[PDB]
Amino acid sequence: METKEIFDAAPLSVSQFLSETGQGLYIPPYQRAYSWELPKIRRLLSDVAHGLDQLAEFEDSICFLGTVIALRDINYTTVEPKYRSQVPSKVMTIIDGQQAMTTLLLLTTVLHEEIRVRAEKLTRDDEPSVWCYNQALDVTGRLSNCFEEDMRYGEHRYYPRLIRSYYDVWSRNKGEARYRSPIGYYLESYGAYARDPDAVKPYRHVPIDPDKTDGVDLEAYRHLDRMRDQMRSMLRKAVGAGVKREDDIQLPTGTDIGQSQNLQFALFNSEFPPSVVEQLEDDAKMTPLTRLIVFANYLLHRVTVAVVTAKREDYGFDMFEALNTTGQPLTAIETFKPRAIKEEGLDEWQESESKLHFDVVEAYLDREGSSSADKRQTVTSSVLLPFAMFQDGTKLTKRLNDQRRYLRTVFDKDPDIVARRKVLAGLAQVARFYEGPWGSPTKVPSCDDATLRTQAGIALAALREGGHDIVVGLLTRYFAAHRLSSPETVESSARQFLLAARSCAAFYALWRGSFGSTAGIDGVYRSLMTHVVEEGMPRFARFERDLTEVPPVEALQSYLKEQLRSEGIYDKQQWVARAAMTPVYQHSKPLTRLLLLAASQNSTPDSATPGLVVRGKSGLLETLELERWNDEAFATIEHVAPQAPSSNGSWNADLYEDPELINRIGNLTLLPAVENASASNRAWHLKRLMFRALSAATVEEAEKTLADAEAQGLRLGSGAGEIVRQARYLPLVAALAQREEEWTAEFVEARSQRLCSLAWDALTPWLGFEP
Amino acid sequence: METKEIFDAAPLSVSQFLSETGQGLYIPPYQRAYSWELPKIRRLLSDVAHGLDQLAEFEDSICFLGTVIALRDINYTTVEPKYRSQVPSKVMTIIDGQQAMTTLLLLTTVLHEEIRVRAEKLTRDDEPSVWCYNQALDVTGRLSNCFEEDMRYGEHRYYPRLIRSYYDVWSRNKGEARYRSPIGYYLESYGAYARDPDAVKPYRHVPIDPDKTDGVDLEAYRHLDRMRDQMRSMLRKAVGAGVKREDDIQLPTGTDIGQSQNLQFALFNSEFPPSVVEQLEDDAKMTPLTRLIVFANYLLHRVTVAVVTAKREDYGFDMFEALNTTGQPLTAIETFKPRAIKEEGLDEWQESESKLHFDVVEAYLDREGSSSADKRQTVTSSVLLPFAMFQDGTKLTKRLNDQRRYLRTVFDKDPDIVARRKVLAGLAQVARFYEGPWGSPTKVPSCDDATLRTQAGIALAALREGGHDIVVGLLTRYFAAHRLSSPETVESSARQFLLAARSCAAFYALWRGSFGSTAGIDGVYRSLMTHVVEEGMPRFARFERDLTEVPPVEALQSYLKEQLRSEGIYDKQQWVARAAMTPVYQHSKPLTRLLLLAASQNSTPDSATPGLVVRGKSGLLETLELERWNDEAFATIEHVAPQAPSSNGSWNADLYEDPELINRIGNLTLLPAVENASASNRAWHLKRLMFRALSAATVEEAEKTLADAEAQGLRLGSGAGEIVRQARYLPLVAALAQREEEWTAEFVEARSQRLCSLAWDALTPWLGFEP
Amino acid sequence: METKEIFDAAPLSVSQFLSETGQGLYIPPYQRAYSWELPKIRRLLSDVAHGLDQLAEFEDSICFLGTVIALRDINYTTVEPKYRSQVPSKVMTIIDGQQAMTTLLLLTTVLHEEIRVRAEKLTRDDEPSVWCYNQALDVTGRLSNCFEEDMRYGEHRYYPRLIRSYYDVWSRNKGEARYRSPIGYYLESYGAYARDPDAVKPYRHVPIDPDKTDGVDLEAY
């Protein structure tokens, strides 16, 4: 008695864990039911998908999957409704991980379904096609004995794994056998479906309680069933179409597989026959299935869980406790500091560039982290992905090992010094960038061009609010060059940077203006940072090379435009066509602010059409100024027609057959003061008056219309907010007080058309338009 | 590649982990410095001490200590400034647990220190004495080769364990060996002290940097040095004096050890010689040693750490991550539901007494827990310690295994059912007490005596604020009988209960009033729930028995009084002597509220001495009503003489010779409206005026004195808060406005004396005083 | 119960085998006496010498020594006249191999003797010579904790390894400790010589029965 067993750990692939010939995984009777909301599931699939994708590169990288701590219940004292007659020969009552475990088994069930049915759609006379048929069969069987295990006799001849006590008893005889838990039921019913002779139809599922089983919540069954089916969908959508939405689950492609030898050996113990690397090179009708098979094999043999087996139940609990108190793993920066202490040069570094740089990074991390520990890591990620754009041009992930690995890779490229401490200077400049124009954008840099300063200042403050960190690469890349240049070429830098800022705002506004989403833009900027620019002169995002240098000022503009062609559309007609019909308030409200501010650039109320607006005053009151983003003069996105009219205060239902109408530009303006809090809103008459208040060019009409609207009750809430003697010029709201008629739907169409045309006119000079 | 090592875990006693003959534990160069603040150290020691204490009971209970994950650095690739000639033959660069480890080594250092020098004070001529010296010798050496290790030649012939990289190189040669980290330095110098012949003094310690080593913080050495010396002091204060403060670290006593066969077998592989159990039974100069020796021997052989070993470093980090994802260990109530599902009677329970009870308990936990997870266990403790008082009479600890154990122990005594499901009715009733009079005390029970209701209501609302949960047993015990009674004996029950509440408030009011602390009270109430009361009629806290029955109504009072004797003092004279001189505001502020509301019970401003108060109005305005605790009429504790007077606003330093003066009754009253928030305070004149304001019995003295004090400025902060036409009677503030003279210390003593006498008068009838 | 331990095998070097911080190797009482006539000893030594010679060439070649099968006597049911007060904490009654083990301990004893005494003839002032003294020192001790083990108090403070039942009781106390078997007595006496200060004379050996011990044959001795 000292280590007298107590406990017992080993690593196992999901295949060797799940498919052990005489085993049952048993959910003991104090566990909650299945929880994991889909986000955890997606992190799950995407971790294994990343492990596999990184297996092509690193031939030994093994991906982990957590721990399961379980009781090797030897005298079956924990299987609480049991038929000892024939309980399985090794039951493992699962103390923790039982959730991950449930998820896994289901994942196998979906993988089995797909690989089977896609494998039957296979033309078995192609030589490669038959290979892919054979290989599918293989994985099919190997997923088969992964979730069920063939006891040899009886009805209910097959046992699941995972079971829950109380609902579900393992047995193979004809009475007496239940599988009524969510996971128990699911595994039974899938398993029986798989054994349908004459099957090959995809899996339906007939959820339970034909008239019974309220020993669980009925809500639990709903959840588990839904989880399984949504992984089924996730995976299905991961090899199929081309919509390729940002998350999804990226597993390597037909060409990827086809050309990675190491992936081939480590998952099929052999090199592919050449006819298959050919058929794969261009997906060719069998590659979705083959991608599903590669992913399935990786899941079997290369995702490994840590299995901790105690012999007594109480030791198991004490173990659970002892492993819940296990320290605070460190950011990839911390675990990487050594590897540059150990290049400067020996250990004698304290007045040595890298220290300074690192001190910078470290300052930022302690400043903006500190508060907790995963806040510290969320900050380290914020300074690490933009850098991965910057000093290399690759999309870094939010998983620890990746930040560790990429940082190793990049630091150990230019194996010298002066080069390596430039690599560190990158990170430093990035943290300082986040301190300058992103803390309070008003610093930007210096330079004259006093319109440029507050114009790129609006660009930044709008890029910050509402995501678009994909840009923080580029801009830091440029923000670097303003501090790295022969004291003469400060002013050149200051301009390039400022223009870049402005151009990235515009392309932001356009790209999300027309489409509904950050659709490609991240990947488009990624291509921008990799693509060859002007023969061999440079590369877009400082890539080795030399920090000060590269690219120019403007190759951004032309490339971004060249892409605004393609699947972008950039003719004001085509563009305003797309953008007039996209709910901008539904997306980012800061996008809609930028767009409204760009559509009211030195603008004036239109007379020919009452309620539109037109330009032409060169410098009336130019709004694309950072002092006017924050300008809480006019700083509220007010819908003309409200989103909520639950009993219809009146209004025109023209506007609501299509619920995206209420959310286009033509339905919004920038209203000072009140939103929906102090004094605001009503139905389109009180709204007309409210706009009519804020538009008068004399107080011998401001006081007058303040009183005009107090009859119906303009002083709503008390006695009107900051509403007595308001000056202030608001061109959109003017020609909105000038429209009587009514709030027709056609009018929002023409209005959003008008505003988009104006904003496009106002901004497209920011990419310097001629394409 | 499937289990290709990846990792490799085992359990080891701290002795087998630390003192393996060729091993060196290495703190790699990215670990933080030594963190562990003293709360965590105290948890560590009490964890092991609890382990020992529970080994006496259960001869097999093995105690854990967490995990250490380390890289078995095989080619010394992580020993970052090294001399391979003689790096140790196995290094274990610790990826996680290194802080746990640092503490562990320090602990061995102190246990070795104490056992060394105390064993020298042994008269070795005495048989038991020599057994003890020998036993000391054994553990001494076995701790020694625990922290350092004998390489066999050269200066620096001895190697530490734990080392930190960069600072510290293991070697044995004469230049070249450094141990300059905090721990490196500590283990070196401590061991050097241990190897001093002609020593046997206790260890002084000379912290580092005779003029150097400023690659670290200088605070690092400070924290660690201090932490060691305080584990030293902790243990010293665990076997030495008799102060026995609430925390300390409880390890078993000479007799405890002396009589537990299992403790001796399991730590000394043999039964003690009887001459030793004899000398031990009554400490006798040698028992502190043997308690320290037994503590160290349990630490050595029965604390077991989980050791996880990777061969690659990145496998180590990925493992660490995979173990930071380790579930949410469950409340002892969850893990106990099964074992009462399986006595009711079989699995057919859904309409079967116990279900009811659990539903109660579960509901309460789900209601007020919920929000988080450690809130859920905190709430499960709040219902389990008082339950442990009710159905048994024991102090449960807040630790998981103890709750599990006690729940199993208690539930399985009377092995029947109706005995057991009564045991469960216990828990349910504790939850319901938490739902009746503790959620809002205004429920109380039914009954007439409508004065009992608000009197016991202030009792409860006063016991709740300011801790004093030790009572929750008793009262629940009673609250059950009010809900379980032959429909006639409801009003009897209802009365017992209400009076019970009052009594506990009174005893509470008294006990912390006279003492400075809840010194005995916990033990006193535990004594009551165990003490035999009236032969074999019942037992004070339902102990098996039968829920409705027991105890009486009033044995509470008699026992509480009988103990108010002993080390209590209860003669009005003696009690006011103690209580006049205990700064009650320093202790629990609800204690001062209870005392002032009892001291102003229909109280009247005293004329004979300007500023005291005297009683006698039987029903003037009686304050001991739950309606008057919340009564934010008079609900602000105002010090007459302020706690803040850093430069003396003027005031009298007579009161500040003793910092406990400012916080006695005689400097406090109950003030309405403002504390120090709206309009408040100043120097003793303005304070006089403020008291004179609220005491006006006419409006033509209310307004007149409102303006009087605005001359000096009563409207402080803006213009006097809720201060215009205030009726409201506060007898204390009048005779505080009736003292001119000055605010002397002699007067504060007299005033606190008077108030204390009065409150004692008001309350001691709540225990039905005659003793 | 299918592999429920039954058995348990591993390789260990003679160092990590012999010098386990808390182990005692016990010759159970049905084993014959020490037999190995000198040719078997000579093979033992030439095997270890050959393995070492073949280590220069093949940097990985590891040399074996046969097998020991032993019972991890956990409740000390086989240590036949025992003082449980202080039996070693882990005994291993050798079921097979006890003769190879007898030889091995004897081998360490003579290697310790030679390296010790030749290292004292070292002029400790010569760089290599001091390199070589230290190195002797290292090995010397690392062979000591190989054959005996320092329980930490009493007379008969040191425990052998290997012991035979009936003859020989591990204890560290002053009555009550016997070592009278051939090997028990040898390792005891050798250990004593080793720990002699002021020695560094080669080992004589003053064999048993100052008047006693015909509980074995005297020929075995």
Numbering used by the authors:
A (entry chain A), B (entry chain D): 1 to 771
C (entry chain C): 1 to 221
Paste lines from the article.
We then determined the crystal structure of SspER100A, a mutant with both N-terminal GTPase activity and C-terminal nickase activity deficiency, to a resolution of 3.48 Å. When the structures of the NTDs of SspER100A and wild-type SspE were superimposed, the CTD of SspER100A was observed to have an en bloc movement of 2.6-3.9 Å toward the NTD domain. As a result of this conformational change, the R404- and R408-containing helix moved away from the NTD, yielding a larger space for DNA. This result was consistent with the observation that SspER100A exhibited a DNA binding affinity similar to that of SspECTD and stronger than that of wild-type SspE. Given the conformational difference between SspER100A and wild-type SspE, we next wondered whether wild-type SspE underwent a conformational change while functioning. When the flexibility of SspE was analyzed by normal mode analysis, a computational approach for the analysis of collective motions in biomolecules, an intrinsic vibrating motion between the two domains of SspE was found, resulting in its conformation alternating between an “open” and a “closed” state. Strikingly, the structure of SspER100A resembled that of the predicted “closed” form of wild-type SspE with a root mean square deviation (RMSD) value of 1.724 Å for 622 aligned Cα atoms. Remarkably, the GTPase-defective SspER100A mutant bound to pUC19 DNA as strongly as SspECTD, whereas SspEK40A with enhanced GTPase activity bound to the DNA substrate with a Kd (22.2 μM) comparable to that of full-length SspE. Therefore, a tempting speculation was that upon sensing PTs in host DNA, the GTPase activity of NTD was stimulated, subsequently promoting the dissociation of the CTD from PT-modified self-DNA.
